[PDB]
Amino acid sequence: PLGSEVYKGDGYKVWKLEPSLGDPLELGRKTKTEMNAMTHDEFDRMKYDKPSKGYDKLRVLLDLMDRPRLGTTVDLCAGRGGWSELVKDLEGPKGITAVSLWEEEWMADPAIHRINANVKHLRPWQVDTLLFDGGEAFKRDQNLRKEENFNDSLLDAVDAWMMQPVPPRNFVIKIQVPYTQKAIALLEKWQVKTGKGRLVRLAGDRLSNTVMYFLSVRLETQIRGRVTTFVRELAERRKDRSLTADPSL
Numbered sequence: 282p283l284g285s286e287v288y289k290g291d292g293y294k295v296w297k298l299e300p301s302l303g304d305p306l307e308l309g310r311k312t313k314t315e316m317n318a319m320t321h322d323e324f325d326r327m328k329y330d331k332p333s334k335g336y337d338k339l340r341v342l343l344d345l346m347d348r349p350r351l352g353t354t355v356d357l358c359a360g361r362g363g364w365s366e367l368v369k370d371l372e373g374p375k376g377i378t379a380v381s382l383w384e385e386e387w388m389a390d391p392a393i394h395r396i397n398a399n400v401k402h403l404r405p406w407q408v409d410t411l412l413f414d415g416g417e418a419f420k421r422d423q424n425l426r427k428e429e430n431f432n433d434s435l436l437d438a439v440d441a442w443m444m445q446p447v448p449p450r451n452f453v454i455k456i457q458v459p460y461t462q463k464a465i466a467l468l469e470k471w472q473v474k475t476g477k478g479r480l481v482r483l484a485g486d487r488l489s490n491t492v493m494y495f496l497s498v499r500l501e502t503q504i505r506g507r508v509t510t511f512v513r514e515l516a517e518r519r520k521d522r523s524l525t526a527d528p529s530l
């Protein structure tokens with residue numbers, strides 16, 4: 282009788298990702314290329330109070346993490362502040378520092394301490410909890426290596442926060458483009474560094490992006506093959522939601 286433990290299953294929260302064979306970089310570029318070619322109708326079919334929608338997403342992710350106590354928290358790329366606001370509701374505003382580039386308007390509690398800075402600039406420091414929600418999708422006319430390099434360059438800024446002597450006990454790190462060699466290598470290094478970490482895909486996320494999150498739950502390894510499975514499955518779902526199945530029936 283597994284009892285209450287059943288309630289911490291993945292259920293409707295995240296995709297099931299078992300590892301599979303393949304090159305994730307090549308599959309990711311292939312489905313991105315097909316997404317850039319999609320017609321207006323195809324793309325639209327496939328693409329579908331609180332300070333933002335980030336509030337509920339972080340609530341899902343923290344529930345997966347078994348509702349940990351957060352303590353001193355840095356929210357990197359806080360934007361409008363949905364994540365920071367959820368941390369405020371959970372534990373008060375005193376432990377949060379929001380970091381973002383504003384000029385996005387802050388839509389969360391103004392008692393929350395804010396630093397108007399480029400997260401690539403700040404020297405890291407020691408926190409109980411690290412949140413990172415940076416990441417940008419590029420437009421369909423951009424060379425693919427542009428988007429990959431830009432988001433790799435953001436994750437490299439997170440790398441200094443993860444690799445410090447006392448790493449964050451809790452972390453929630455958005456991975457905009459998880460199939461680059463640098464993202465996969467960074468996640469493996471963070472798993473070795475912390476002894477923790479699982480890369481998840483939220484259920485209900487838009488098929489029009491490849492966002493995953495790295496969470497400080499019990500270790501789940503073979504990240505490369507799980508990204509491979511994620512990208513292949515994402516590609517098939519994009520196929521099906523973009524057609525327009527002809528009957529034929």
Ligand SMILES: C[S@@+](CC[C@H](N)C(=O)[O-])C[C@H]1O[C@@H](n2cnc3c(N)ncnc32)[C@H](O)[C@@H]1O
Pocket residue numbers: 332333334335336357358359360361362363364365380381382383385398399400401414415416
């Ligand atoms: C998608 S928002 C995150 C939303 C937020 N977590 C919420 O719940 O509302 C990411 C924000 O990071 C900011 N950003 C992008 N690059 C940045 C950088 N290099 N340094 C600091 N902020 C950055 C953008 O302005 C954007 O508003």
